[PDB]
Amino acid sequence: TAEQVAAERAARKAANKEKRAIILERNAAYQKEYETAERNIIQAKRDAKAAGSYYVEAQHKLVFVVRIKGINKIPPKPRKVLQLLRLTRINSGTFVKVTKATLELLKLIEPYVAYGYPSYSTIRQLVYKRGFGKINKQRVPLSDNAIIEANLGKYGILSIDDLIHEIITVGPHFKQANNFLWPFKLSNPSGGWGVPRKFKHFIQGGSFGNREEFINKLVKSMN
Amino acid sequence: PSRFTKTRKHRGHVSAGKGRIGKHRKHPGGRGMAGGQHHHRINMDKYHPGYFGKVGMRYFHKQQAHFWKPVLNLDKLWTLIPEDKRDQYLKSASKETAPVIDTLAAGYGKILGKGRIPNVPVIVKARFVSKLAEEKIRAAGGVVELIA
Amino acid sequence: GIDHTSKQHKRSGHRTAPKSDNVYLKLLVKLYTFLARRTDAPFNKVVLKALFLSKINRPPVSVSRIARALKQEGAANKTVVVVGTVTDDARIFEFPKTTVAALRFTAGARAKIVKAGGECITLDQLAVRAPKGQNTLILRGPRNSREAVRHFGMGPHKGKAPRILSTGRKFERARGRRRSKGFKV
Amino acid sequence: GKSHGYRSRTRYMFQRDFRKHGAVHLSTYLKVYKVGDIVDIKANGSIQKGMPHKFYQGKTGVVYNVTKSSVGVIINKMVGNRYLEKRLNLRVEHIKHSKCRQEFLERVKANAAKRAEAKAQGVAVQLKRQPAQPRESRIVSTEGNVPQTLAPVPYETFI
Amino acid sequence: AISKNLPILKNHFRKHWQERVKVHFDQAGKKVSRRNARATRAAKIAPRP
Amino acid sequence: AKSKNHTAHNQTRKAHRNGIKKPKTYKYPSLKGVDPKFRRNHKHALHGTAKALAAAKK
Amino acid sequence: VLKKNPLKNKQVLLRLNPYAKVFAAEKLGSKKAEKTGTKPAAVFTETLKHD
RNA sequence: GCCCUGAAAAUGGAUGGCGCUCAAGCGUGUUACCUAUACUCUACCGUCAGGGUUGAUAUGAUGCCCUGACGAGUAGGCAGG
RNA sequence: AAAUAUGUAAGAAGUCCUUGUUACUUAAUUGAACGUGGACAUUUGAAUGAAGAGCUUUUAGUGGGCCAUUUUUGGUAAGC
RNA sequence: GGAAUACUGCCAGCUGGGACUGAGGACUGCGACGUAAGUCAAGGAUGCUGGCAUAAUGGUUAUAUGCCGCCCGUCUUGAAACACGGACCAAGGAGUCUAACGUCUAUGCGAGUGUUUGGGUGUAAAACCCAUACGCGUAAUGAAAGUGAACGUAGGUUGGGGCCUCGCAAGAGGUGCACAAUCGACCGAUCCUGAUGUCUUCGGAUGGAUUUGAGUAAGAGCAUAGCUGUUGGGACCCGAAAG
Ligand SMILES: NC[C@@H]1O[C@H](O[C@H]2[C@@H](O)[C@H](O[C@@H]3[C@@H](O)[C@H](N)C[C@H](N)[C@H]3O[C@H]3O[C@H](CO)[C@@H](O)[C@H](O)[C@H]3N)O[C@@H]2CO)[C@H](N)[C@@H](O)[C@@H]1O
Ligand SMILES: NC[C@@H]1O[C@H](O[C@H]2[C@@H](O)[C@H](O[C@@H]3[C@@H](O)[C@H](N)C[C@H](N)[C@H]3O[C@H]3O[C@H](CO)[C@@H](O)[C@H](O)[C@H]3N)O[C@@H]2CO)[C@H](N)[C@@H](O)[C@@H]1O
Ligand SMILES: NC[C@@H]1O[C@H](O[C@H]2[C@@H](O)[C@H](O[C@@H]3[C@@H](O)[C@H](N)C[C@H](N)[C@H]3O[C@H]3O[C@H](CO)[C@@H](O)[C@H](O)[C@H]3N)O[C@@H]2CO)[C@H](N)[C@@H](O)[C@@H]1O
Ligand SMILES: NC[C@@H]1O[C@H](O[C@H]2[C@@H](O)[C@H](O[C@@H]3[C@@H](O)[C@H](N)C[C@H](N)[C@H]3O[C@H]3O[C@H](CO)[C@@H](O)[C@H](O)[C@H]3N)O[C@@H]2CO)[C@H](N)[C@@H](O)[C@@H]1O
Ligand SMILES: NC[C@@H]1O[C@H](O[C@H]2[C@@H](O)[C@H](O[C@@H]3[C@@H](O)[C@H](N)C[C@H](N)[C@H]3O[C@H]3O[C@H](CO)[C@@H](O)[C@H](O)[C@H]3N)O[C@@H]2CO)[C@H](N)[C@@H](O)[C@@H]1O
Ligand SMILES: NC[C@@H]1O[C@H](O[C@H]2[C@@H](O)[C@H](O[C@@H]3[C@@H](O)[C@H](N)C[C@H](N)[C@H]3O[C@H]3O[C@H](CO)[C@@H](O)[C@H](O)[C@H]3N)O[C@@H]2CO)[C@H](N)[C@@H](O)[C@@H]1O
Ligand SMILES: [Mg+2]
Ligand SMILES: [Mg+2]
Ligand SMILES: [Mg+2]
Ligand SMILES: [Mg+2]
Ligand SMILES: [Mg+2]
Ligand SMILES: [Mg+2]
Ligand SMILES: [Mg+2]
Ligand SMILES: [Mg+2]
Ligand SMILES: [Mg+2]
Ligand SMILES: [Mg+2]
Ligand SMILES: [Mg+2]
Ligand SMILES: [Mg+2]
Ligand SMILES: [Mg+2]
Ligand SMILES: [Mg+2]
Ligand SMILES: [Mg+2]
Ligand SMILES: [Mg+2]
Ligand SMILES: [Mg+2]
Ligand SMILES: [Mg+2]
Ligand SMILES: [Mg+2]
Ligand SMILES: [Mg+2]
Ligand SMILES: [Mg+2]
Ligand SMILES: [Mg+2]
Ligand SMILES: [Mg+2]
Ligand SMILES: [Mg+2]
Ligand SMILES: [Mg+2]
Ligand SMILES: [Mg+2]
Ligand SMILES: [Mg+2]
Ligand SMILES: [Mg+2]
Ligand SMILES: [Mg+2]
Ligand SMILES: [Mg+2]
Ligand SMILES: [Mg+2]
Ligand SMILES: [Mg+2]
Ligand SMILES: [Mg+2]
Ligand SMILES: [Mg+2]
Ligand SMILES: [Mg+2]
Ligand SMILES: [Mg+2]
Ligand SMILES: [Mg+2]
Ligand SMILES: [Mg+2]
Ligand SMILES: [Mg+2]
Ligand SMILES: [Mg+2]
Ligand SMILES: [Mg+2]
Ligand SMILES: [Mg+2]
Ligand SMILES: [Mg+2]
Ligand SMILES: [Mg+2]
Ligand SMILES: [Mg+2]
Ligand SMILES: [Mg+2]
Ligand SMILES: [Mg+2]
Ligand SMILES: [Mg+2]
Ligand SMILES: [Mg+2]
Ligand SMILES: [Mg+2]
Ligand SMILES: [Mg+2]
Ligand SMILES: [Mg+2]
Ligand SMILES: [Mg+2]
Ligand SMILES: [Mg+2]
Ligand SMILES: [Mg+2]
Ligand SMILES: [Mg+2]
Ligand SMILES: [Mg+2]
Ligand SMILES: [Mg+2]
Ligand SMILES: [Mg+2]
Ligand SMILES: [Mg+2]
Ligand SMILES: [Mg+2]
Ligand SMILES: [Mg+2]
Ligand SMILES: [Mg+2]
Ligand SMILES: [Mg+2]
Ligand SMILES: [Mg+2]
Ligand SMILES: [Mg+2]
Ligand SMILES: [Mg+2]
Ligand SMILES: [Mg+2]
Ligand SMILES: [Mg+2]
Ligand SMILES: [Mg+2]
Ligand SMILES: [Mg+2]
Ligand SMILES: [Mg+2]
Ligand SMILES: [Mg+2]
Ligand SMILES: [Mg+2]
Ligand SMILES: [Mg+2]
Ligand SMILES: [Mg+2]
Ligand SMILES: [Mg+2]
Ligand SMILES: [Mg+2]
Ligand SMILES: [Mg+2]
Ligand SMILES: [Mg+2]
Ligand SMILES: [Mg+2]
Ligand SMILES: [Mg+2]
Ligand SMILES: [Mg+2]
Ligand SMILES: [Mg+2]
Ligand SMILES: [Mg+2]
Ligand SMILES: [Mg+2]
Ligand SMILES: [Mg+2]
Ligand SMILES: [Mg+2]
Ligand SMILES: [Mg+2]
Ligand SMILES: [Mg+2]
Ligand SMILES: [Mg+2]
Ligand SMILES: [Mg+2]
Ligand SMILES: [Mg+2]
Ligand SMILES: [Mg+2]
Ligand SMILES: [Mg+2]
Ligand SMILES: [Mg+2]
Ligand SMILES: [Mg+2]
């Protein structure tokens, strides 16, 4: 027996050493993938400026929604929507793929949430610290890519940065990659909400709405 | 027994299980079958349709056993022949020595037509047999003998 | 606070062990609980669940119901399993051989099973002969043949039968039972 | 006293349209309805016989029967909490031919013909519909269009 | 009154029935004494059956 | 004395607890309310197409 | 038994994403970028600064 | 706009109270700060769910062990005591 | 002639090809249903969610209600 | 013209101060630093030093202080109420038993079931034992005279767990009990058709039918028992004016 189990271990130890090589491969390739893309966009603006024209950016495909309202006294149609977006608890948030299907699920929910367009960090630090996943109910922390690979592996996505990539880049399996993610339980903003009163719209009084890029300063302080 | 009964569970709660608003009074709605035509109408139709009125014909001094006709079917039949002999009689299949089954003396006296029987023949001693019953006994090569 | 999308601290409707105290029944469960867990056999799971059923859910499987099931094509030799008691039926005549693994067999059932040269297996014996329950044909008695299930859902125009003590004429055939007295159902 | 009879409140509802009245044209009578047809229900006041109750106006159902002058339509209405199954015997003047499903057939059929294009080539199918999308980056030319700059207008009374 | 779905019963107990009620507690002694009553007949009656 | 008359208040609420169900459809629906001399002739069209498979299989 | 937080606790930062070692070694959160000389079209400063 | 007149009721009295006049007032802006049975992290009790386990070697298989979520309540129901 | 609210569809119980039955139907191998045998899956034919889906029996209490925003009737109005 | 600076944002950049927590209890995991031996902060606190038995510390209790806290019970949309009962204490004090029942459950036996009216018997109201009956079930349906459940492996189509065949699998094919939808057959009732025969009015073959039933279609029931629910009972307890 002593050789037999040693064969499983010595090979599995080597299987992992190589399974970790697949990762360093990808994440370094992911690092370039982002570094070029933002550099592209940053340049295309300048070119168009030199040409006389204007670079109009692609509208955002990805949005992060944290529900800032309690669970009390909510009208049914918003109430049902918040459940379908998986925000049933205050100060919790999920990712949403922006499409005129879900776009109407927002804006109808607008009274009860603040949201916007999350940065790389914001997603990375959200998944690293608060990242959990759903396995037969069972909210499970992602402490190991093995957990992810065991579940999201059928889609690719064997890393934790494979999850992050599949989220920020949206892409083909974003439905299940995002649905795998348990909704994010967040603390109240460290340092306050910046407003006096939350439930005026961001444009007027602050919070409660689409604050666009300003969701990052908020979500990061709620993390 | 009492120790199992829910009214021991209710000791300490005002009003047993009976409610604060409606309590438990003496006879709201009236005793017994009262008001079946009025406030209990909805319950008498629906769960007891036909309950009210008359239908059909009376019978004075009617005595049952003028009517006594315990019903037996070819579905059974052969049960009336004890178990062991039932074998060898089925094995025989004879028109010469064939088993005699007296239904009236067996607790019966109308033979009906439900279900198949073997080709083994039977002498059916009975009263009041159904048309399809007999004809199925003719398929086994057997007869019916009316008696009283 | 949570806005709950389903009811908290709800228990699933299914039993766990039986409600019966029979110490032998409790052992057969201890067997087949173990079986269903450590095998791939789905049959053991099925038998395990059926061991908790209540006498209303384990209606008698008649021998003729066993016989006709052996007349099924391809199942002819299989050892049939009934997780409840088995009854004798005089209505048949030529009854085949097999072997029948059940909880209980009525005296007529047992003795007439063997007259055709067959065994009455008891469920642990069946477990040892067939640990994965292979080449087994599971049989169920009718549970909607029951008396009480005749009166269920008694509405107007439902053609069901009413709870009734005596019966004849004079009993619930007049007003509402015909167009001639009131209405009909 | 309250008044709840069959056609109450239907005044405007069962009216024929402004400058459409009289006899109903022949397209209505010349239409064929077999079982399974999905039909929209709208009553017609000119025809009193075999017309829907005012409830089913606007509802759409699947015809379960075909008779001489009428088609039985099975419709689903809610009472309390459930939908029971209503079946109406309605004449053809009150029956439309529903365009709800009609395009779905023209969808499936176009889907099978685009399947042969992945059979004869092997490219990816993209059969199932996708909702409208965020759009994309573009460049807007200042050539021949230079932004003209506006301010808000003052207040002045127009009467 | 009248509720749920239950057969209609007829219970004739409006009459002071609790007055005329016979338990048989004596079923024992009305047998033990029904025997001894027969036993000593045949005694007194001598061989006759 | 005088009291309330009618309301629909809270009824949508009660009817959404267990409520609103669905038509619970099956394939092969009931034929209730179909032309009699269809459902008459339809019996014999099926009565006859039975023998067709009471022959073919042999 | 205890969730540890890859944003701190370097060990789990390396347990996931082994690329972290490279990223640190290479700076790369501080990465400089190639300098560009592009200048905007004089129409664009006409509109921008206009009125 | 702010203020003033318009501006009359019965025990003594109420911007909550003292009292405040470039306010401790009114409009507006910007930050810091205070603290709910709410949010985040963790320990513990219970409830529900999923998983492992007498192959054992004692002393409980109604057990033992692992995991996740949840916890307002009158009338009322049921359970375990 | 809106806004809001509202019925229906978005598939394998699908889309088709063939041709057996009948007492219905047609000028009629015309139809109508219901079958026999056969063509096609991989985004299987919108999004989102699902703490599992369906089913059955039984039985408590309740059957005076009131309040806020909004739509709204009577009333000069009302803590009507 | 070349910077600087602000502002916003990123770093898997480096560091200082404070606070709360230390669940678990041999090893199994994933890792990182390693040329290696090996080391670690890597699936939950260890190392070190000191302090305490006239006692540190912890429980209770009284008092004080900060903040808080209206009288319960009841009816009620709403009670601390200027609504009702209650000055105090002990003892007593209210959903019972019965007959007939519904669902459910446990049990015995099972096309059957029920010893206890009675008899036998006895260590004598027990326990043990047993004939004939009777009750309910095994047939329904008509008001009634009556008639009385297999065209078909006791049917057809669609589902279906398990079992079976090939398949690593994924699937596929086969059998398909309970059960669901639906098309049929069967028994009775209703309407229609009315044969061979007959003593001429009897007999009712065969064949139909948007009609009907608390039916049939390889039985489930009978019995003792528990909670809960029904009705009759004084009927949860106490209470009329009356007759
Ligand atoms: N239907 C007439 C007959 O009724 C009988 O009824 C018996 C049971 O149904 C009845 O049980 C009742 C129950 O119906 C009722 N809903 C609850 C009550 N607790 C039960 O009563 C039972 O428990 C009490 C309390 O210890 C005992 O004192 C009593 O003797 C006992 N039978 O006890 C009856 C015997 O005293 C039998 N069902 C049967 O012989 C026959 O059907
Ligand atoms: N493709 C293999 C299949 O195996 C089947 O039989 C075996 C298993 O596949 C089957 O397992 C269960 C099944 O009992 C139950 N009724 C349905 C369940 N989904 C099945 O489970 C199957 O699917 C689940 C989920 O994807 C997997 O986790 C599991 O590994 C897989 N066997 O039960 C058998 C073992 O207990 C059948 N023979 C047939 O369908 C086919 O051969
Ligand atoms: N089994 C014991 C016997 O049961 C009898 O009752 C059974 C039958 O005899 C009784 O049927 C009656 C019958 O009593 C009477 N003499 C003739 C009457 N036409 C029958 O009625 C029959 O048709 C009617 C509809 O017309 C149905 O409601 C009824 O269920 C059916 N049995 O209905 C019972 C079956 O459901 C007697 N009630 C009883 O005294 C006797 O001991
Ligand atoms: N702190 C008192 C201030 O006055 C408010 O209350 C004021 C009003 O209630 C009251 O006004 C009444 C008016 O209703 C009624 N006609 C009677 C009386 N003559 C008026 O009084 C008024 O007098 C003149 C205007 O008339 C004002 O200059 C004066 O400030 C005001 N008190 O005079 C009160 C005192 O001024 C509030 N108590 C409070 O919110 C506010 O801070
Ligand atoms: N979405 C596709 C679905 O396919 C379904 O089809 C399923 C069933 O109809 C079909 O079942 C067949 C059955 O028709 C036939 N009469 C018997 C055969 N053994 C079954 O086969 C199936 O079940 C067996 C047993 O577990 C498995 O071993 C086997 O893998 C499986 N194909 O197997 C399919 C599942 O594998 C249905 N048509 C429907 O729900 C739907 O169209
Ligand atoms: N009435 C008897 C039945 O007649 C059926 O045939 C009748 C129709 O069903 C059959 O029509 C078939 C149809 O069955 C099938 N499912 C579709 C096919 N397109 C039809 O074909 C029809 O259309 C084509 C042109 O399109 C004509 O050339 C042809 O004559 C016509 N019958 O043509 C016949 C008259 O229209 C079948 N022979 C059979 O099911 C059965 O014998
Ligand atoms: Mg957008
Ligand atoms: Mg989401
Ligand atoms: Mg969009
Ligand atoms: Mg702070
Ligand atoms: Mg604030
Ligand atoms: Mg402030
Ligand atoms: Mg922070
Ligand atoms: Mg924080
Ligand atoms: Mg107790
Ligand atoms: Mg209590
Ligand atoms: Mg108390
Ligand atoms: Mg109470
Ligand atoms: Mg009290
Ligand atoms: Mg109660
Ligand atoms: Mg009370
Ligand atoms: Mg009441
Ligand atoms: Mg009567
Ligand atoms: Mg909580
Ligand atoms: Mg059946
Ligand atoms: Mg049935
Ligand atoms: Mg009917
Ligand atoms: Mg009865
Ligand atoms: Mg009349
Ligand atoms: Mg009448
Ligand atoms: Mg009116
Ligand atoms: Mg109009
Ligand atoms: Mg119009
Ligand atoms: Mg007319
Ligand atoms: Mg009144
Ligand atoms: Mg009022
Ligand atoms: Mg009222
Ligand atoms: Mg009124
Ligand atoms: Mg419920
Ligand atoms: Mg933990
Ligand atoms: Mg004053
Ligand atoms: Mg003052
Ligand atoms: Mg103030
Ligand atoms: Mg002062
Ligand atoms: Mg002052
Ligand atoms: Mg102040
Ligand atoms: Mg100010
Ligand atoms: Mg400051
Ligand atoms: Mg707390
Ligand atoms: Mg468990
Ligand atoms: Mg609770
Ligand atoms: Mg609760
Ligand atoms: Mg409670
Ligand atoms: Mg309570
Ligand atoms: Mg306890
Ligand atoms: Mg043909
Ligand atoms: Mg999902
Ligand atoms: Mg109820
Ligand atoms: Mg009620
Ligand atoms: Mg009331
Ligand atoms: Mg009011
Ligand atoms: Mg008020
Ligand atoms: Mg006011
Ligand atoms: Mg220069
Ligand atoms: Mg320059
Ligand atoms: Mg900066
Ligand atoms: Mg460093
Ligand atoms: Mg510890
Ligand atoms: Mg290691
Ligand atoms: Mg190294
Ligand atoms: Mg190494
Ligand atoms: Mg090493
Ligand atoms: Mg020490
Ligand atoms: Mg102290
Ligand atoms: Mg106080
Ligand atoms: Mg009171
Ligand atoms: Mg009062
Ligand atoms: Mg009041
Ligand atoms: Mg109340
Ligand atoms: Mg009021
Ligand atoms: Mg009070
Ligand atoms: Mg007062
Ligand atoms: Mg009072
Ligand atoms: Mg008082
Ligand atoms: Mg007083
Ligand atoms: Mg007193
Ligand atoms: Mg007093
Ligand atoms: Mg005192
Ligand atoms: Mg009972
Ligand atoms: Mg004695
Ligand atoms: Mg008997
Ligand atoms: Mg006949
Ligand atoms: Mg025939
Ligand atoms: Mg069938
Ligand atoms: Mg099938
Ligand atoms: Mg596979
Ligand atoms: Mg006739
Ligand atoms: Mg016939
Ligand atoms: Mg039966
Ligand atoms: Mg119960
Ligand atoms: Mg009194
Ligand atoms: Mg008196
Ligand atoms: Mg009087």
Side-chain angles (χ1 to χ4, degrees), chain C residues 47-100:
Chain C
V47 165
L48 205 256
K49 312 180 87 62
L51 280 180
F52 321 138
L53 293 187
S54 30
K55 175 178 177 171
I56 185 197
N57 292 134
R58 298 181 283 90
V61 182
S62 169
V63 53
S64 66
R65 167 168 249 96
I66 309 183
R68 158 194 300 252
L70 302 170
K71 294 167 149 284
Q72 285 184 44
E73 174 174 330
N77 315 275
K78 288 174 181 172
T79 69
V80 314
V81 179
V82 165
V83 200
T85 97
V86 175
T87 51
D88 188 339
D89 189 16
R91 291 180 294 202
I92 57 178
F93 292 113
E94 259 142 41
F95 156 69
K97 171 150 176 158
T98 37
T99 53
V100 181

Side-chain angles (χ1 to χ4, degrees), chain A residues 16-142:
Chain A
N16 298 348
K17 163 159 184 169
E18 142 79 350
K19 195 185 283 181
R20 167 172 304 263
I22 321 166
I23 289 187
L24 202 323
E25 255 270 12
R26 291 156 166 252
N27 301 15
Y30 286 152
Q31 178 69 21
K32 144 172 291 187
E33 172 175 338
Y34 306 150
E35 186 179 321
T36 67
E38 188 198 311
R39 263 301 109 163
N40 298 138
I41 301 199
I42 291 187
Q43 201 67 217
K45 294 184 182 179
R46 319 169 135 180
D47 296 337
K49 279 202 292 173
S53 300
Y54 293 103
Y55 183 85
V56 51
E57 187 161 338
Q59 295 191 119
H60 301 72
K61 246 146 61 179
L62 190 260
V63 109
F64 187 67
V65 174
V66 4
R67 120 110 90 147
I68 62 169
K69 190 58 175 46
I71 50 100
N72 274 120
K73 284 167 166 167
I74 317 293
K77 186 136 110 174
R79 198 184 204 261
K80 183 54 171 301
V81 158
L82 288 129
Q83 296 166 2
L84 290 169
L85 296 193
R86 291 192 302 161
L87 324 155
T88 48
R89 186 195 292 97
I90 167 89
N91 267 211
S92 78
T94 69
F95 287 99
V96 154
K97 174 176 189 184
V98 184
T99 166
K100 212 267 179 319
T102 73
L103 197 277
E104 288 305 307
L105 288 190
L106 308 179
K107 139 211 213 173
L108 174 163
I109 208 185
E110 255 198 348
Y112 320 102
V113 297
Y115 74 101
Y117 314 120
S119 62
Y120 176 81
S121 300
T122 298
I123 307 162
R124 174 173 181 272
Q125 309 171 355
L126 266 163
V127 187
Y128 267 41
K129 166 175 205 79
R130 308 212 107 93
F132 282 66
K134 162 165 58 189
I135 333 288
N136 321 63
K137 190 197 287 273
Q138 301 270 307
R139 168 185 185 254
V140 173
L142 322 171

Side-chain angles (χ1 to χ4, degrees), chain D residues 5-104:
Chain D
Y6 207 103
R7 276 178 67 186
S8 69
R9 311 189 210 186
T10 54
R11 178 212 252 204
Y12 292 79
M13 188 165 106
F14 285 1
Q15 277 179 177
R16 307 187 53 63
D17 298 52
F18 167 63
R19 279 163 40 195
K20 303 220 237 301
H21 280 273
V24 54
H25 57 204
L26 280 301
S27 299
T28 304
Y29 297 97
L30 271 189
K31 224 79 76 66
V32 189
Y33 300 130
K34 42 216 295 198
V35 189
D37 292 25
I38 304 179
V39 298
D40 306 329
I41 312 194
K42 163 168 173 55
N44 191 321
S46 35
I47 291 301
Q48 283 81 39
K49 305 212 71 185
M51 67 181 313
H53 178 276
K54 83 209 196 185
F55 170 78
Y56 310 102
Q57 166 99 9
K59 268 86 164 186
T60 297
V62 159
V63 355
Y64 84 107
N65 193 31
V66 186
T67 199
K68 167 194 159 181
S69 51
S70 289
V71 292
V73 190
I74 272 182
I75 201 48
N76 274 324
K77 91 141 72 164
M78 181 228 75
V79 298
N81 44 0
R82 65 209 142 117
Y83 299 92
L84 304 191
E85 188 189 51
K86 320 294 295 175
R87 47 230 288 152
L88 306 323
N89 298 329
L90 311 180
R91 299 182 66 103
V92 195
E93 306 92 324
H94 317 294
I95 294 289
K96 215 192 235 290
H97 224 137
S98 61
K99 290 238 71 187
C100 66
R101 146 156 289 250
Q102 179 66 23
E103 83 85 51
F104 166 66

